[PDB]
Design a protein around this nucleic acid. Structure first.
Ligand SMILES: [Zn+2]
Ligand SMILES: [Zn+2]
Ligand SMILES: [Zn+2]
Ligand SMILES: [Zn+2]
Lengths: 620, 586, 190
RNA sequence: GCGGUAGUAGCAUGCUAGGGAGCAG
RNA sequence: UGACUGCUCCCUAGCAUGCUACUACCG
């Protein structure tokens, strides 16, 4: 906290990797043997050898991921398009990347029009398209890191909020695992820069044996390895016309972050009935179970949701450090005290402030999160819980204590002030008491910066529980953003669920004998997915009939909506599926002579196959 | 882990584990080699050893395959499968083998621990890849033998031409002269530091090297054993006499360096190789120099076998050929740096086979075939792939330092493949013109091996002397001494005034060191001392045993001196063959 | 599947038993036939099953070892590629200015952000518009980072040559404006 | 007379592996 | 040029378990 304030005086060219000259068989290299953080000060590597013989495979991998050689063997660059610090240009040309439009499925559009759709004055219309971008879009989108400013925190209050958050994250287990227990799916994805010139992640997960991976992972508990992050543009459907960009992290960072965090990440995504709902599905009655869990037994229930403007470009560094420290608290037996600090330093040097490669040039990332590391959503959930806790603390501590009728709450406020500003060490009894109070009067359900809260209403009116105004104030003074209350909702009737959670609305329908909650999407999104595709081979329905089956699975609960076009969407999808099947069979029987059968295929255009996906009975 | 087997050239994945060089063996070949020989270890992509915990069996005929690992009789699961069955080992490409019948000779090559003459007989009597494998494993065993020696513990130095140096406990004194190079590396605190390329004189330690370092503490003199790389090209490429002179350009004029050099070109321009069959000082030097300007538009390579024999390699090239046309290749040991190092484009490169800048040519010259093995021929054929080349050298010279053989001497037919290639079908070239030499060597080596194709060019005044003295031999260490040399040098310089400035052939280098300490004569090496001979030389007794005197060590020693060649009859020599003047000692 | 070790015995017993049956002998020979053929087929059963299990096991082992060999080959080639890339990018370090600024350091360590700033030979500038252009690189030589640079070439967003005589206020709206200027260090490195 | 065992065929259930596709943060 | 997670549908291959069936052996 003090280093953050003091680092704003010193010049910005004295931060980052520290390099020196080493000799390998009489030839000189330039490698990084330390780091200078704005928050953590000066860090020196522990195992550095100047004179050495011919190097091995993992040394080659480490030296090929360091930005030192790439920056030192490049040209100077002065870029006036952005205000962020610039390092070097790797080539003699600047690359401009564009985004192409979508492909039009005319047959589906004609079929939909021939059934009374897209008429004037209708309540269902297309507002999801593929937007195109011009050459200078990647740099324009990268220039949004100017909203990240150095922020000092109230340390005596953060040191209590972190205890409450750790109480929230208490029902799991974690630790370190060996290289043979790591689970990777889709090994056919990019490996980052400069490793994308020779293959995908399969090549590097096959060429490296198990003890090589173990030695590489054990190397990062005594040294710091800075890497390079590549920025890519997305090609997807959306409702707004701004460019979207994701970050491609290097393989040397992901390979070790998996071994560090995967056990805890898998343990979190396997628990039901907790505050974090990552891993729970919405089919087979999952949505109803989540909604019933979040309602708990609150006394005067209302519902509330909020929004984070520029969530990843504006999150201060201190909260990211806090999230990493909270996640790394499960290593009390497998790791020492220096190993944990060096792991934290490696994480900070790789995914918090490092060189990014936009276009064909190297830039310096000021701060924030790089969406695309191995621990994105869980860290976002920790950050969301931290913000909610500090909002509750600010709401309770800023109330006239002479007007609180209940004496228990008055004593709670007195003890809260004493534990914040008059106590130096942790007091577990009051932490447990405050955690119980919060869980009784303020219930949460969190999924990576999306949240729904069921709170006591009279307590919030009297000021003993956080409100929207408290969230606005906390965001203003701790996040450097303004949160307009036009993107937040409030629901005073519990028979209708949250107004929006994970882009889905909620309706209470009668199925069987009882009443359950079902989610339904926006009809415009489903129709836009039907009519606008990436690829040309998806403008011929017979080649892929399984797209429309999934799209009709997503659009089933629209048949219980009081509005009439909403069910017509599902019926139109069923008729199109039947038409595509008939077209395939006849269109194949005609020129060729192969005769097709309709055995157990009619299930796809009858509603009973889709009705079974929202009825509580686990299958497959 | 995947390649061709040394006999069928078929694809395999099996490596024999009981051969020091780990050759690639075909599955049927693997079975034949493992059955008829106590070579009971086979390597694959994974080793063929029992993986049962706590177990230790390294056979192949004993293991059973079960599950995914390999198991033995004591741990075979109910689902077991023997690896060694059907006379064919289990490996990749098992269905695309052809086998071979040359397994007995391959077994003999593999099993030969290199003891007797038959070792080299069968080394030179086999098919091409077996020649390559035999040469590779011969150099491997000799380098292992010489690395099985101690480290020269040195902590101080007296002065120049003096040294105190100690070997290890249980290790004997290594061989003496530059034929076994002494290049060591000391340490200061954390790594190794340079010492110098040296060689020792006697046991007083004079320095016959070419540098001087601040030698004292922590010094480690060692005969550096080097890892041997595998061969690529065969020992020789079968020649075919061309009709077109492709690339070769006989100039309009005649660059008349030598007269018969025109015929030289005439028959070296069409066949894929040749050889300069040169008696000492008989055009063995500058016929290539004449070829340099008669064929100036031809890429010409020059090489030898040792860094010592670069005299004629480097002198006349700069002496008469143009300055820029020459080029120098030297690792950086101590040798002639007269031309330009670090230059890839040139038409006349002069070096040794130690290290060259990888390129191909169309004309090469290669010196010192007598002490050249098939390994050196293969490496020069691999590094340089040319159209024609000449191997300078003569069978009437010394063999390579093949200290491995002890019973039978290695004769001309056993030098290398080429050295008998020109012995059976005849030499590519045969000269008969001695540049500067009386007819003593003419008579001697023409009655012995030259078949009298060269005759008297300079007159025979019979000033050379050979006496009736015999000598007495005594062994002390791996070098011996001669009391009828400690007394005989004086007894032979008693009154004859002509051989006081003669050169001392050294069958025993320690004896030459003692002669230098007592009376004083220059030390003259035997093997790598051709062309360094002066006008006047003494052939001394120095031995009677089978160390040096059967035929081919004195064929060049008789040519060291020109007029006054004192070659006394030492032992069972070629006494009753010629006419020689004699003076009886008092 | 037809020349198994027990096949000869099974077939010979079956042939002899069926010949005895075709001989029309008593019921005892028929009972002996039935028992012998039943036990013969029973013993042929495992000999026909175990072999088929073993062949599939061997085939799986062969496939796994082949894929292991392919993985090793790929590893070797990627190692060679990485070594080549490193040794190729080594040859542009400008080993006199770099050595001059390394030796001035008190322990050999220097920040990475000041190596291109003090040792690079070429500079690249990207200019949004003309107002920014006339304040940064006006003329033919300009000063930046306490050094003097002289212009060498100017291209546009389409990578086509542009001469400085036409970069004016009037002619500004006729150029693909993300201009890229290349300069050399004057008096120092290139 | 009943049971056990050994193969063979059809059917059902849950995992692992491979491929194609959909949604969400 | 194509990041990190979560859930779901379809197709094929293998393994394990269970149900039924057909022969044969044994008591
Ligand atoms: Zn740990
Ligand atoms: Zn062997
Ligand atoms: Zn073979
Ligand atoms: Zn065993």
């Amino acid at each position: 906290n003090f280093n953050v304030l003091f680092s704003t005086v010193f010049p910005p060219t004295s931060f980052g990797p520290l390099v020196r000259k080493i000799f390998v068989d009489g030839v000189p290299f330039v490698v990084s043997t330390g780091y200078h953080f704005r928050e953590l000060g000066v860090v020196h590597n522990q195992d550095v050898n100047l004179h050495s013989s011919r190097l091995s495979f993992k040394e080659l991998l480490v030296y090929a991921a360091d930005p030192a050689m790439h920056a030192a063997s490049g040209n100077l660059l002065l870029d006036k398009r952005t205000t962020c610090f610039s390092v070097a240009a790797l080539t003699n040309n600047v690359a401009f990347q564009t985004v192409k439009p979508g492909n039009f499925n005319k047959d589906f559009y004609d079929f939909a029009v021939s059934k009374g759709f897209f008429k004037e004055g209708s309540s269902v219309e297309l507002k999801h398209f593929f937007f195109a971008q011009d050459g200078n879009a990647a740099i324009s989108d990268y220039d949004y890191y100017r909203y990240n400013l150095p922020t000092m925190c109230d340390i005596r209050q953060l040191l209590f909020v972190v205890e409450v958050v750790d109480k929230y994250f208490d029902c799991y287990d974690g630790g370190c695992i060996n290289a043979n227990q790591v689970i990777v799916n889709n090994l056919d994805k990019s490996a980052g820069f400069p490793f994308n010139k020779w293959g995908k992640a399969r090549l590097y997960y096959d060429s490296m044996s198990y003890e090589d991976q173990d030695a590489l992972f054990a190397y990062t508990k005594r040294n710091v390895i800075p890497t390079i992050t590549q920025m890519n543009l997305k090609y997807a459907i959306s409702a707004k016309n701004r460019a979207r960009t994701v970050a491609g992290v290097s393989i040397c960072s992901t390979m070790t972050n998996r071994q560090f965090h995967q056990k805890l990440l898998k343990s979190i995504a396997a628990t039901r009935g907790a505050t974090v709902v990552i891993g729970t599905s919405k089919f087979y009655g999952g949505w109803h179970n989540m909604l019933k869990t979040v309602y708990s037994d609150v006394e005067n229930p209302h519902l509330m949701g909020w929004d984070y403007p520029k969530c990843d470009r504006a999150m201060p560094n201190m909260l990211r450090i806090m999230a990493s420290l909270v996640l790394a608290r499960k290593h009390t037996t497998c790791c020492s005290l220096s190993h944990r600090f060096y792991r934290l330093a490696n994480e900070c040097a790789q995914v918090l402030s490092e060189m990014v490669m936009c276009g064909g040039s190297l830039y310096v990332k000021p701060g924030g999160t790089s969406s695309g590391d191995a621990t994105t959503a869980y860290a976002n959930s920790v950050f969301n819980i931290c913000q909610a806790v500090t909002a509750n603390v600010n709401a309770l501590l800023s109330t006239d204590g002479n007007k609180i009728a209940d004496k228990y709450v008055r004593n709670l406020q007195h003890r809260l002030y004493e534990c914040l500003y008059r106590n130096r060490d942790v007091d577990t009894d009051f932490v447990n008491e405050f955690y119980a109070y919060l869980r009784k009067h303020f219930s949460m359900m969190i999924l990576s910066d999306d949240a729904v809260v069921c709170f006591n209403s009279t307590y919030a009116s009297q000021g003993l529980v956080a409100s929207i105004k408290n969230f606005k104030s906390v965001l203003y003074y701790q996040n450097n953003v303004f949160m307009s209350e036009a993107k937040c909702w409030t629901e005073t009737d519990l028979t209708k669920g949250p107004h929006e959670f994970c882009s889905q609305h909620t309706m209470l329908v009668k199925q069987g004998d009882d009443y359950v909650y079902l989610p339904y999407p926006d009809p415009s999104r489903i129709l836009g997915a039907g009519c606008f595709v990436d690829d040309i081979v998806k403008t011929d329905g017979t080649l892929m009939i399984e797209r429309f089956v999934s799209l009709a699975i997503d659009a089933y609960p629209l048949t219980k909506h009081p509005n009439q076009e909403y069910a017509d969407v599902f019926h139109l999808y069923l008729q199109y599926i039947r038409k595509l099947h008939d077209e395939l069979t006849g269109h194949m029987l005609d020129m060729y002579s192969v005769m097709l059968t309709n055995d157990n295929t009619s299930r796809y255009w009858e509603p009973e196959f889709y009705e079974a996906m929202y009825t509580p009975h686990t299958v497959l | 882990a995947v390649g061709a087997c040394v006999l069928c050239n078929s694809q395999t994945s099996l490596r024999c584990g009981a051969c020091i060089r780990r050759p690639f063996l075909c599955c049927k070949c693997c079975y034949d080699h493992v059955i008829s020989t106590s070579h009971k270890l086979v390597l694959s992509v994974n080793p063929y050893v029992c993986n049962a915990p706590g177990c230790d069996v390294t056979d192949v005929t004993q293991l059973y395959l079960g599950g995914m690992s390999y198991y033995c009789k004591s741990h075979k699961p109910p689902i077991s499968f023997p690896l060694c069955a059907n006379g064919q080992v289990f490996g990749l490409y098992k269905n695309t083998c052809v086998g071979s019948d040359n397994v007995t000779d391959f077994n003999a090559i593999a099993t030969c621990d290199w003891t007797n003459a038959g070792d080299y007989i069968l080394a030179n009597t086999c098919t091409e890849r077996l020649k390559l494998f035999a040469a590779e494993t011969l150099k491997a065993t000799e380098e292992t033998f010489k690395l099985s020696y101690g480290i020269a513990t040195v902590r101080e130095v007296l002065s120049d031409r003096e040294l105190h140096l100690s070997w290890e406990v249980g290790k004997p004194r290594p061989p003496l002269n530059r034929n076994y190079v002494f290049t060591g590396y000391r340490v200061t605190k954390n790594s190794k530091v340079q010492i110098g390329e040296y060689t020792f004189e006697k046991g007083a330690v004079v320095y016959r090297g070419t540098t001087t370092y601040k030698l004292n503490v922590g010094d480690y003199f060692v005969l550096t054993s080097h890892t041997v790389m595998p061969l690529s090209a065969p020992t020789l490429v079968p020649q075919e006499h061309y009709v077109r002179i492709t690339g070769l350009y006989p100039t309009l004029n005649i660059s008349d360096e030598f007269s018969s050099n025109v015929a030289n070109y005439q028959k070296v321009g069409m066949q894929k190789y040749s050889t300069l069959q040169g008696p000492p000082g008989t055009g063995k030097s500058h016929f290539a120099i004449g070829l340099a300007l008669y064929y100036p538009s031809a890429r010409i390579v020059y090489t030898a076998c040792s860094h010592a024999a670069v005299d004629a390699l480097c002198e006349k090239a700069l002496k008469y050929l143009p300055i820029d046309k020459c080029s120098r290749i030297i690792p950086a040991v101590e040798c002639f740096d007269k031309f330009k190092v670090n230059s890839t484009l040139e038409q006349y490169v002069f070096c040794t086979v130690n290290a060259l800048p990888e390129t191909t040519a169309d004309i090469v010259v290669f010196d010192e075939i007598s002490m050249a093995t098939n390994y050196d021929l293969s490496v020069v054929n691999a590094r340089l792939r040319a159209k024609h080349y000449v191997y300078i050298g003569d069978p009437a010279q010394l063999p390579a330092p093949r200290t491995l053989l002890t019973k039978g001497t290695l004769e001309p037919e056993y030098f290398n493949s080429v050295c008998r290639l020109m012995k059976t079908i005849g030499p590519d070239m045969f000269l008969g013109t001695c540049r500067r030499c009386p007819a003593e060597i003419v008579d001697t080596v023409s009655a012995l091996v030259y078949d009298n194709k060269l005759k008297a060019h300079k007159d025979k005044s019979a000033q050379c002397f050979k006496m009736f003295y015999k000598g007495v031999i005594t062994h002390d260490v791996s070098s011996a001494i001669n009391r009828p040399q400690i007394g005989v040098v004086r007894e032979f310089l008693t009154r004859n005034p002509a051989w006081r400035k003669a050169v001392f052939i050294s069958p025993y280098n320690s004896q030459n060191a003692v002669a230098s300490k007592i009376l004083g004569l220059p030390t003259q090496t035997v093997d790598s001392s051709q062309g360094s001979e002066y006008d006047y030389v003494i052939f001394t007794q120095t031995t009677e045993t089978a160390h040096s005197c059967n035929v081919n060590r004195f064929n060049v020693a008789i040519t060291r001196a020109k007029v006054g060649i004192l070659c006394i009859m030492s032992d069972r020599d070629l006494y009753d063959k010629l006419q020689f003047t004699s003076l009886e000692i008092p | 599947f037809s020349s198994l070790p027990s096949y000869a015995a099974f077939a010979t017993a079956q042939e002899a038993y069926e010949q005895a049956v075709a001989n029309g002998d008593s019921e005892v020979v028929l009972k002996k036939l039935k028992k012998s053929l039943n036990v013969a087929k029973s013993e042929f059963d495992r000999d026909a099953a175990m072999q088929r299990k073993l062949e599939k096991m061997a085939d799986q082992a062969m496939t796994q070892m082949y894929k292991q060999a392919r993985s090793e080959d790929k590893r070797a080639k990627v190692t060679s590629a990485m070594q080549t890339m490193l040794f190729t990018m080594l040859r542009k370090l400008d080993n006199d200015a770099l050595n001059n600024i390394i030796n001035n350091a008190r322990d050999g360590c220097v920040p990475l952000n000041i190596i291109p700033l003090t040792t690079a030979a070429k500079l690249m500038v990207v200019i949004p518009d003309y107002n920014t252009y006339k304040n940064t690189c006006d003329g033919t030589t300009f000063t930046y980072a306490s050094a003097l640079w002289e212009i060498q070439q100017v291209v546009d967003a389409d990578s086509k040559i542009v001469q400085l005589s036409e970069i004016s206020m009037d002619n500004s709206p006729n150029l693909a404006w993300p201009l890229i200027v290349t300069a050399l260090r004057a008096n120092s490195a290139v």
